[PDB]
A paper describes a structure:
Here structural analysis of hydroxyketoacid aldolase from Sphingomonas wittichii RW1 (SwHKA) revealed a dynamic movement of the metal cofactor between two coordination spheres without protein scaffold rearrangements. Holo‐SwHKA forms a trimer of homodimers, in which each monomer adopts an (α/β)8 triosephosphate isomerase (TIM) barrel fold. In total, holo‐SwHKA contains six equivalent active sites; each of which is formed from amino acids from two different domain‐swapped dimers. The transition from M2+ R to M2+ A,S is induced by bidentate substrate binding and occurs without a concomitant rearrangement of the protein scaffold.
To gain insight into the earlier observed activation of the enzyme by phosphate and a possible interaction thereof with the metal, phosphate was included into the crystallisation and soaking studies. Neither was the case for SwHKA. Docking studies did however reveal a potential docking site, close to H44. The docking does however support the earlier proposed function in the pyruvate deprotonation, studied by H/D exchange. In both cases 100–300 fold improved deprotonation rates were observed. This could be enabled by a phosphate in concert with H44. In the presence of ketoacids, bidentate substrate coordination affords M2+ A,S as the lowest energy complex and predominant state in crystal structures. Bidentate substrate coordination therefore seems to constitute the driving force for the transition of the metal cofactor from M2+ R via M2+ A,W into the catalytically active configuration M2+ A,S.
Author numbering:
A (entry chain AAA), C (entry chain AAA), D (entry chain AAA): 1 to 250
B (entry chain BBB), E (entry chain BBB), F (entry chain BBB): 1 to 251
Write the structure that this text describes.
Amino acid sequence: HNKVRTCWNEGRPALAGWLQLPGTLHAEALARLDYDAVVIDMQASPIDFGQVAPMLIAIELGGAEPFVRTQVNDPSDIMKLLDAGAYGIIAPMVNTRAEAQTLASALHYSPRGLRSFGPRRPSLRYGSGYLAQASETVVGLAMIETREALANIDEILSVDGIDGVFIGPTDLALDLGHAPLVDTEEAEVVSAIAHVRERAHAAGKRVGIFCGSGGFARVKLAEGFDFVTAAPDLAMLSAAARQVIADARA
Amino acid sequence: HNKVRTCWNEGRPALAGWLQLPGTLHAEALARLDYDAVVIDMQASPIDFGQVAPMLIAIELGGAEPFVRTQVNDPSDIMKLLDAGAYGIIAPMVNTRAEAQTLASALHYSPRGLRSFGPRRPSLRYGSGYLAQASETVVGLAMIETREALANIDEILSVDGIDGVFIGPTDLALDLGHAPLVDTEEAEVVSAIAHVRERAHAAGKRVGIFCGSGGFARVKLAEGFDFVTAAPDLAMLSAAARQVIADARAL
Amino acid sequence: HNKVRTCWNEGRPALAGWLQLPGTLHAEALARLDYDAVVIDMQASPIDFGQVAPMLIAIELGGAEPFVRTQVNDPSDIMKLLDAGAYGIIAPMVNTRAEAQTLASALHYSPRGLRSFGPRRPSLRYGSGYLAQASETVVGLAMIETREALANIDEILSVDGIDGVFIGPTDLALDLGHAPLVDTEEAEVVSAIAHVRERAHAAGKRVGIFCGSGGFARVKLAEGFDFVTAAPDLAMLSAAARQVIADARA
Amino acid sequence: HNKVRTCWNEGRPALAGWLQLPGTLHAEALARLDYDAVVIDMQASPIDFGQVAPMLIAIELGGAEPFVRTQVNDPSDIMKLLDAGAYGIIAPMVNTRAEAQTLASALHYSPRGLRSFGPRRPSLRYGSGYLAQASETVVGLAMIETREALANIDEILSVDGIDGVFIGPTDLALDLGHAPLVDTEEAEVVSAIAHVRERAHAAGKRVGIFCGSGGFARVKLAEGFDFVTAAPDLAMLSAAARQVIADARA
Amino acid sequence: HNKVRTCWNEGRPALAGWLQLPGTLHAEALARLDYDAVVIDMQASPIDFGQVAPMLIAIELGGAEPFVRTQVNDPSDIMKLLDAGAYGIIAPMVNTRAEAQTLASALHYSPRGLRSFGPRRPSLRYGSGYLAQASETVVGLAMIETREALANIDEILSVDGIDGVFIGPTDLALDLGHAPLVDTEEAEVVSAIAHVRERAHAAGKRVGIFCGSGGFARVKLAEGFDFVTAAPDLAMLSAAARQVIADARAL
Amino acid sequence: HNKVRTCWNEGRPALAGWLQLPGTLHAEALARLDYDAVVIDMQASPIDFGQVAPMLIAIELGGAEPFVRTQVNDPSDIMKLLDAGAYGIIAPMVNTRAEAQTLASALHYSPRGLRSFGPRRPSLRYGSGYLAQASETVVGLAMIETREALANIDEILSVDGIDGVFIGPTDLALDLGHAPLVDTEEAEVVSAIAHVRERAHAAGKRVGIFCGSGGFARVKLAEGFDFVTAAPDLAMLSAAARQVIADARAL
Ligand SMILES: [Br-]
Ligand SMILES: [Br-]
Ligand SMILES: [Br-]
Ligand SMILES: [Br-]
Ligand SMILES: [Br-]
Ligand SMILES: [Br-]
Ligand SMILES: [K+]
Ligand SMILES: [K+]
Ligand SMILES: [K+]
Ligand SMILES: [K+]
Ligand SMILES: [K+]
Ligand SMILES: [K+]
Ligand SMILES: [Mg+2]
Ligand SMILES: [Mg+2]
Ligand SMILES: [Mg+2]
Ligand SMILES: [Mg+2]
Ligand SMILES: [Mg+2]
Ligand SMILES: [Mg+2]
């Protein structure tokens, strides 16, 4: 079973890791922590497909559901990843109902979508009965990180075949005319985010958000978020080394 | 100029990072911090030659001195790394004078060593007049992490063409019959490390040490070690994540 | 000369291999067998471009025409591959005349198409006279694997600059509302396939099909197919190991 | 600062290298020569993203501004590269004002464009003030290599958010119905190129051109070109080895 | 637990696959079959360290024990593989007791061997209390494929810290002056293999063998070999394809 | 047939290219020129096993004989390259007869050597009846680039199973106390090279040499060297670019 979906079915949210660094060793290492999922970021990173492919295997062995935030909302790229044992897709810059249908169409075999049939790695996981349950095995979120996304939120949330939406808070803050700051106090950004969540849950759909600290993720979890990511590997690693250095040199 | 040798020339220590994770992005980032050097571990890691080459380029662009802890003390492996712009070499399990001579032979052109001439990247960095300073551009440390190497410390320090030694405290604890624990303070191991430190300085040679934490590294800097590494990327990242998860899930 | 095109000119079909596993050693090994071509599958596989590039070289040394089934019908991806010594392109999910023109446009230098000029590997094969013969050196098939493709078959086959079409029988079976089974007996799927072939040959164009067994490929060859692939490396390798195990344990 | 932009601000053109061969050693080596920039060609080459990523680092260490000629004018591919320390983008086959706006939109953060915010490598170069100066740090050229591009030159040059255009002379010669020859004497091709340059400078925008010899680049430099590339690594390497062989065998 | 050592503990053989082809997709797939272990050949293959690391992860996710046949019997190569989650080691051309001691030294922490401590992947799999069972988590086999190794079988079996040996029948045939043919039954070679088998069991040590076919492997299981590999991916794939082509082109 | 051995059989020299740059595109292109062979330098370069494998395939498709200058003279490294379709081996720093014997052992199947049997690519190229000609399909050269190797030239040439030697003039100049300069004509080094050439031919053995330029290579062909390499890709590319830049920026 999909571990995030089994979180949701058992009435609780998922906490996910977020990797910008390529490779299998930190991926597995983080996956064995009390993360329900680890997201590989193929957008704001040097991670291409050759590197993602072994990292999905690493996360699954680690005991976390492999998730990928794609470079772009592209049906054929999303389908390749599904076939490689990506079991969650987060599509950036989903701004319209049409783009969200485009996302949906990639996540589901006909007749519900137009997903190409060749399930190399999921067939090994789920076996010859994969077709029947393929849809439930995969989690699909549209990212909301523009003013336009915000305006089209109900129409995006109308789209059958996506589990929910995922807030890109830095892109969202920037396009709102504010500082691209993670975990921001900026009142407009904060109200926009709360508005996205309320609309999502009213549409009976799931909402997630990207966090830069445990402190902030704790708060989002308390406010009812279903899928919270904290924190990117490079940011935690950078912060950790800065502390090691200041402690060593004090 | 070698950033580590500059520290040493002004009679100050060098502080170095330590990578077990392949990739250029974290190698550049940590290199931009207040690290004098960044060591790529090619031993206890999934980093092979193909991954190491571009990480060297990134650490150098970062503005730290590129260091490698080799898989093994093998002269052909060491030479190929130096030609790929390793300016720092930490050769593991150097247990005998013969083995220090073998390290030494790789770090120096004839007649001082038998290093092969083909310095693809060094000649790009130091241009004309690289050869004239080749030996000083490179830093070479013999790793002490065995009973045998503890016994043979004086003969290892006698070898002209090495700068000094580098302690592996966990592997030394293990080989002295004790728990292989991070930043060990097992009394006997503490004694053996103190002895190595003193014999390095008595010999006019630099002494360095592997640290798993900022606390231990600060104490080693205070004990006058010349080269302190702190801490491995993977151990810093796992602890960082464990803490972010505990704060996220806290009542 | 293109070995598949020289098959066709000499009044006989091509039998091609089908690789989902990355690497050069099996590629060369299979290429030296009595395969006229080996197809690299960049869709239902972890094969990205970094891995495809050496595999094209391996197949050509092996003595088989390097063919690639792309992730997607994309002009710029197809052009890169041509430039890397892909000499056959099979484009998945070609559903409309417009998408088939899009395919055609990538395969041909102006004025016949809008192929970007920079023929890194074909220049080495064919020399400074490559331009004059570039078109004949490359084989272009549109895949037919949807109901929509089926409906638009004559219009697809109308498009100047494609050699023919290639049936995706599992995607085709699935979208027809049937089991995604290779080498299927399902009567609708079988009639649809026979209909695609008849229309193709009536349009004086070539038709191929993907097979999962030698038994089935034999039949398609007999029915007049011009380009038959059997069988994917992973499927033959999986089947072979299952036999080795049952023989060893009997 | 961007070294090409500082060339232009100081009233002089840029001479750039052009790499079709993957890897870091020749990249750094060429970057330390009296090249102001080195362009990595991801179109007419086997260079994918995994190989480009370390080559950008190599060029920057070498002391030349890392430039990339993309496979295709794609917003999400261009954005990934920016984030990887590509500081110049040359987009091939820019044929219309709309495609040039598409290019522009990728190069600039909102509100001037819709660039996704996650500046992994430029943040390390420029620091926390990167946002304010992001636009100036990057150089954007639209390639003109079709008749259609030629026809739409004023409209392309109208687009705010591109520095200028870059002539693809072989594709341009080919589509003009002439031989795809580098550094061509063909009178129509020569007049078209001179016309592109004149229109560019009249629009107060920058113009570049791809060259195959130092002799030709010298001439383009004299005619007022702002960004001249000479010559592709494989072509110089091939020519050099042919000379070595003829000298050795004489 | 080591799936091979579990087979052995219940006094049953282990059956293992054999990969010469790089990639994670076929390594996972074959690992999901009724193979106890899957050996990655890093000797007679284009598989280097960079490709081997993710194949280990895939075989383990597949649910077979990850095994490696090394390029050479070299302790630093063996240690780096064990730390990357090789739980099974087959070291080629082990011809002398000294060479078995050298294999042995890599497979065990001090004081039983001189394995370096840095178990990145093993500590993730076996968590707390890995060190307490480290030796049993790993399986190490000395390869017998020479005249010299045939002569020295008893002294190789005497070495405490190896589980047993692994026969290379083709390389042994070749070195005994005979055609290097797959699953050879050359009378003299058959005698030499039988002798190795008997001296392994007399010594209380496990004995294994390379098979190129399911037929030969079944006979070896019947002769009581403890570890049988069958058959190499590339040889299984070429024969599979040859047969599909012959059926496709048949009248 | 081996293109180098064919040259030799008709008593003509072989001319070879030399790659320090990873990638298949330039390896194919230069192989299509009038080069008899193309040597991949795995020593003074960032080329590891993973990059070397597909470059061999490209040089062979190019229509030149695939050659490798190894990182080190190590039999397991040499064997794995031959099985990956290296048909030409240049082993560096071969200084003693023992070291030539060690090269020799890797190039030949028993009983003439102890090469492991697993010829994945060679058996694809030469099909049935590869084994019958395996030794002649491969060319092996001992590199002379030291004082020691100059002294021991006669005992190195005595070793049956090597074709001859390959001079590294820069490394030989360096080790003889002189400037390590490209295509050196330092009088003493010229003497040492002439002596090596004469002792190779006296011994009935082939002699080859590293050239950094077409001029030097032409002179060596004229002095009757049997194998001349000219010139490294990276040195040819940097000079080519320097010249294109100087012409571009000229008044
Ligand atoms: Br945790
Ligand atoms: Br963050
Ligand atoms: Br066949
Ligand atoms: Br199939
Ligand atoms: Br210059
Ligand atoms: Br050109
Ligand atoms: K977990
Ligand atoms: K620094
Ligand atoms: K064939
Ligand atoms: K420069
Ligand atoms: K299994
Ligand atoms: K040739
Ligand atoms: Mg965003
Ligand atoms: Mg040398
Ligand atoms: Mg399909
Ligand atoms: Mg063009
Ligand atoms: Mg150690
Ligand atoms: Mg063997």
